[PDB]
Amino acid sequence: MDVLTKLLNRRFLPTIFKREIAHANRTGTPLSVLIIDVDKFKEINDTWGHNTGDEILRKVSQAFYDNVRSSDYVFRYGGDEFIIVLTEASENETLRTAERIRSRVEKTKLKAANGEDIALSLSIGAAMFNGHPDYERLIQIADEALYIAKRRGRNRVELWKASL
Ligand SMILES: Nc1nc2c(ncn2[C@@H]2O[C@H](CO[P@@](=O)(S)OP(=O)(O)OP(=O)(O)O)[C@@H](O)[C@H]2O)c(=O)[nH]1
Ligand SMILES: [Ca+2]
Numbered sequence: 001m002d003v004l005t006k007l008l009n010r011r012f013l014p015t016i017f018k019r020e021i022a023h024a025n026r027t028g029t030p031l032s033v034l035i036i037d038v039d040k041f042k043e044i045n046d047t048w049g050h051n052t053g054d055e056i057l058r059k060v061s062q063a064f065y066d067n068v069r070s071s072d073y074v075f076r077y078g079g080d081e082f083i084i085v086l087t088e089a090s091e092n093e094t095l096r097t098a099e100r101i102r103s104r105v106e107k108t109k110l111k112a113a114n115g116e117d118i119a120l121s122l123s124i125g126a127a128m129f130n131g132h133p134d135y136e137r138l139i140q141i142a143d144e145a146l147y148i149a150k151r152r153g154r155n156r157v158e159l160w161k162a163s164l
């Protein structure tokens with residue numbers, strides 16, 4: 001009943017990545033990662049309260065599950081940070097999925113106790129597995145893309161590419 005307890009513990013990251021890299025290499029299927037970080041979450045908590053912040057974490061987590069498949073993986077990575085491992089998603093599909101998550105969250109209109117719509121957005125860094133055996137390199141490049149999405153103004157998806 002609590003979507004937060006349905007997210008995978010980040011302890012499972014090495015386990016799942018090592019498995020999925022092997023599967024991808026055998027079958028030739030794309031593999032990618034999204035790192036997702038709630039925008040201005042400190043301001044959300046300061047304005048609407050810690051409890052409202054916690055409800056928002058559920059709303060965004062549910063958006064993740066509603067937009068990915070059971071063959072994808074969703075992890076709680078930090079206080080307001082999440083990782084999604086997407087299997088069988090090309091670069092175009094990866095960006096499409098990320099944009100859908102971003103848009104669905106942006107259009108989520110939660111009501112505060114005063115009837116005011118709470119503004120909410122998130123930023124996403126996306127990257128494709130490029131073949132290096134260490135999954136941690138893939139997380140690093142996705143995180144670089146996430147930082148760029150933030151610096152550009154948030155409420156954004158950025159795909160890692162060399163020209164950045
Ligand atoms: N309600 C709630 N807040 C949390 C939690 N875990 C971490 N945080 C809050 O999440 C806030 C994250 O704020 P940052 O300063 S790291 O960044 P922002 O999200 O405000 O800004 P960016 O858009 O990420 O630059 C912090 O104020 C934390 O206290 C949590 O479990 N529940
Ligand atoms: Ca952060």
Ligand SMILES: [Ca+2]
Nearest residue numbers: 037038039041
């Ligand atoms: Ca944040």
